[PDB]
């Protein structure tokens, strides 16, 4: 399957894309103001993520850090990035059917849409002002509004016994984007796509 990932924000982003256990095609690029990277990804992922990070710094070899989403220090993630990341989250051809969800349960750091490409579904976005409205104890120094379970490690906030209620914080998430995920248990926000779509994720897409 096709992503292309295309930065419309006034700011460099540096694109990540990984399952966790492994990056996605090349795994990270930069991302100039206007720029759109153009991945493959294997038919039958499963937990696949695309995210932005911001302000970072890189040597020559692909080593360094970034303010939001470093992934252990790499331009080339393979692994996850540290919160707070907006997410792009997606499992292709899980029998005859592609899921993608847009996740602000690791927080929030770039508005972005996630859109299919071809026929038959609808895409989701987040694009509101989460950064600039964040409660003053989410709020990251290096820039993004965390997720209430990255700052305060509660089982309440991780919903780490499987059992776990909305929360003043994930209200607030909720409120301003709705059609993402605002905790754990939130009622799903994912889409049900034909099973190898294209897409299209755009950073900063208003």
């Given at each position: 399957?096709?992503?292309?990932?295309?930065?419309?924000?006034?700011?460099?982003?540096?694109?990540?894309?990984?399952?966790?256990?492994?990056?996605?095609?090349?795994?990270?690029?930069?991302?100039?103001?206007?720029?759109?990277?153009?991945?493959?990804?294997?038919?039958?992922?499963?937990?696949?993520?695309?995210?932005?990070?911001?302000?970072?710094?890189?040597?020559?070899?692909?080593?360094?850090?970034?303010?939001?989403?470093?992934?252990?220090?790499?331009?080339?993630?393979?692994?996850?990035?540290?919160?707070?990341?907006?997410?792009?989250?997606?499992?292709?051809?899980?029998?005859?059917?592609?899921?993608?969800?847009?996740?602000?349960?690791?927080?929030?750091?770039?508005?972005?849409?996630?859109?299919?490409?071809?026929?038959?579904?609808?895409?989701?976005?987040?694009?509101?002002?989460?950064?600039?409205?964040?409660?003053?104890?989410?709020?990251?120094?290096?820039?993004?509004?965390?997720?209430?379970?990255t700052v305060f490690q509660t089982s309440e906030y991780c919903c780490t016994t499987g059992?776990?209620?909305?929360?003043?914080?994930?209200?607030?998430?909720?409120?301003?984007?709705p059609d993402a995920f605002s905790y754990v248990l939130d009622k799903p926000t994912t889409?049900?796509?034909?099973?190898?779509?294209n897409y299209r994720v755009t950073f900063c897409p208003t």
């Amino acid at each position: 399957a096709t992503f292309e990932i295309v930065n419309r924000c006034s700011y460099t982003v540096w694109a990540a894309a990984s399952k966790g256990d492994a990056a996605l095609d090349a795994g990270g690029r930069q991302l100039n103001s206007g720029e759109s990277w153009t991945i493959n990804v294997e038919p039958g992922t499963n937990g696949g993520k695309i995210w932005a990070r911001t302000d970072c710094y890189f040597d020559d070899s692909g080593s360094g850090i970034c303010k939001t989403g470093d992934c252990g220090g790499l331009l080339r993630c393979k692994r996850f990035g540290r919160p707070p990341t907006t997410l792009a989250e997606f499992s292709l051809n899980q029998y005859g059917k592609d899921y993608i969800d847009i996740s602000n349960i690791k927080g929030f750091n770039v508005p972005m849409d996630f859109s299919p490409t071809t026929r038959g579904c609808r895409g989701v976005r987040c694009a509101a002002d989460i950064v600039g409205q964040c409660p003053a104890k989410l709020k990251a120094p290096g820039g993004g509004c965390n997720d209430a379970c990255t700052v305060f490690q509660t089982s309440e906030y991780c919903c780490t016994t499987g059992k776990c209620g909305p929360t003043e914080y994930s209200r607030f998430f909720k409120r301003l984007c709705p059609d993402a995920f605002s905790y754990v248990l939130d009622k799903p926000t994912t889409v049900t796509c034909p099973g190898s779509s294209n897409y299209r994720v755009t950073f900063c897409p208003t």
